[PDB]
Design a protein around this ligand. Structure first.
Ligand SMILES: *[C@@H]1O[C@H](CO)[C@@H](O)[C@H](O)[C@H]1NC(C)=O
Lengths: 49, 49
């Protein structure tokens, strides 16, 4: 499964300048659309599993 | 540059940070548009950068 984002820290060091032209996620954020992170992590689900 | 400002270039009013791009504009180009049909780069008219 290959994902456009998971709320995984966008800090404008990547998303401002070069990558703002291609990363869908930077454009969404710069236009006021936020992906929020899930409450449980992919580690916490792995522990329950 | 690198400070938040009410920019205007050629009547392209807006609000933002400005910074020295590496984008290889060919000599005829003046704007870059983001995916969202919104300007993300400009060539300064007084000093062509
Ligand atoms: C603006 O004026 C200065 C002299 O006053 C000159 O160096 C410069 O070439 C002018 N701007 C442009 C884009 O030519």
């Amino acid at each position: 499964v290959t994902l456009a984002d998971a709320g995984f820290i966008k800090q404008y060091g990547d998303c401002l300048g070069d990558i703002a032209a291609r990363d869908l996620i930077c454009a969404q954020k710069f236009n006021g659309l936020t992906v929020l992170p899930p409450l449980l992590t992919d580690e916490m689900i792995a522990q329950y599993t | 540059k690198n400070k938040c400002v009410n920019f205007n270039f050629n009547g392209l009013t807006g609000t933002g940070v400005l910074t020295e791009s590496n984008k290889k504009f060919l000599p005829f180009q003046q704007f870059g548009r983001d995916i969202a049909d919104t300007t993300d780069a400009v060539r300064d008219p007084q000093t062509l950068e």
